[model samples]
Target: AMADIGSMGDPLTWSKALKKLEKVTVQGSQKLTTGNCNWALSLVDLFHDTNFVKEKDWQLRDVIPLLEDVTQTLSGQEREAFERTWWAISAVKMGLQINNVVDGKASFQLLRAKYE
Candidate 1:
C-alpha cells in the first residue's frame, strides 16, 4: 500500500474535517505534526480564504493553541522547516481547490527540496 495523502474528499462538505482536527489540539497532545495536522491546517486555510470560515464566524485564530504547541520546543532550522510545512500545505490545498495541480505539486516539491 502507498501513503494516504488524502483530503476531506468533498468540496461541499463544509468545515467538518477542520473542526475535528481543531479539537485534537484543543484537548492537548504532544503530537503536533502528525499527518492530520497538515491536512487540518491546509483545509482551514483553504476554507478561510474562500470565505467558508468567515461565513460560519470562524477564524484561523481558532487554531492558535495548536500553533503554540508547534512552536513550544523548537528553534533554528527545525522551527523554520516546521513553519514552511504550514505554508506548503496551504499552497497545495489552495492549488488543489482551484484545480491548479501544477502549482499544488510545486508546493510539495518546494517542501521536498528543503524538508524531505
Candidate 2:
C-alpha cells in the first residue's frame, strides 16, 4: 500500500504530489539512452505544461547534457534498469490522465521515495 491522493485530498496536496512525481520522472529521464528522444520530448511537454521547467529556471538546453551522458554512460544491466524506470514513470502519467489518480499517486509516492 502507499499514500492516497483521493478526492478527499485538497487541490494543493494533489498538485504537490504532481510536482513530486515530476521530479522523480525527470531524474529517471536522466538515465535515458540515444534511442529515447520521444521519451525526453514527453517530459519536455509535461514540464512545459506544468510550468515546472520555467519555474525552476531550467532551460530546454539543459536536457541535452543529460541525454548525451546517458547515451555515453549507460550499458548492459544499467540500461535495462533505466528502461524499467522509464516505463514505470510513464505508466503513472497515463494513470493520472485516465482518472486513476488514486492508484497513480500511490505508485508515484512509492517511486518518489525509491528514486530519491
Candidate 3:
C-alpha cells in the first residue's frame, strides 16, 4: 500500500495521511469541547482546496451543522484532519467512478491504506 503522496518511504501513504488526520481530530476535540459551533464552522476554509460543496457534491449549508457537531471540544488540528479524510474519501470516490478497471483498483488501494 503506497500513496502517490507518500514520499516519506513509509510504504503506506494512506496510513500516514490517516495519522495526520487523527492528530488534527484530537486537537479539534480539545479546543471545541464546549460545542463552539462557529469555531467548528471554520473548517470550510480547510476544505476550500477540495471545494467539497462543489466537487464532492456536498451541500455547504447542510455540512455546516455536521462540521460543527464534530468540532465541538475539538482543536484546530482535529478539524483539519477531519477535512483531510473528506478529501481522501472524495479521491477514492472519484477513482471508483472512473471507467477504467485498473484505476478503480488503484483508488480502492488508496482507501485501504488508511485501514491497513
Candidate 4:
C-alpha cells in the first residue's frame, strides 16, 4: 500500500518488493512507523527521459507515468504530488532497488533545484 526500505546490514539497504517468505529483522511491525525515502533526482531523471515524448514542460500528470515506472523500479513511497524528498510516503516491505545511487550518501533533492 505504501513504500519504504529495509535494512540489510549496518548500512541501510533497500529492496524493490517482498518476493519471498524468508525470515528477516525489520523495524516497526505496522505501517505508521515506516516511511518512503524520496529522492529528487529520480524525478529529474524521469523528466529527462520523458520530457520530449510527453509535454512541453513537466507537470504532475505527465509525471504520473514516471511515478508508475518508479514504483516498479524503486520502492519506498506513495504518489502524493510533485514535491521533492517527500516524507509523507510509507510502505511495509522493501525489495525495489533501482532508483538509488550506489554512492555512500546521495542528495534527496535534485542538483537543479538548489543554489549550492
The top-ranked prediction according to TM-score is 1
lDDT (Cα atoms) of all candidates against the true structure: 0.38, 0.37, 0.36, 0.28
**Per-residue CA lDDT of candidate 4, range 1-116, in tens?**
64335422211222222222012222233222112232433454554564422332232322433444453444453333222222111111112122322210122232212211
In candidate 1, stretches whose alpha carbon ends up further than 4 angstroms from where it belongs are 1-65, 96-116
Q: Model 3, residue 98: displacement in angstroms?
A: 13
Model 3, 27-73: lDDT tens digits are 22342121232222345545433343333243332343344345444
CA shift at 98, candidate 4, in angstroms?
28
Worst lDDT run of 10 residues, candidate 4, spans 87-96
What TM-score would each prediction reach against the true structure?
A: 0.28, 0.25, 0.23, 0.24
Best by lDDT: 1
Tens-place lDDT per residue, model 2, 1-116, is 66534433222322333443344432323532333423443444453354333352232223332333443355775454443433333333333432222224455444444433
Give the per-residue lDDT digits (tens) of candidate 1, residues 1-116. Answer: 55536543322222443333222221123322345544444444453454333354332323433443554445765554444444333333323332222224454444334323
* lDDT accuracy of residue 53 in candidate 3: 33
Error of 1 at 67 (Å): 1.8
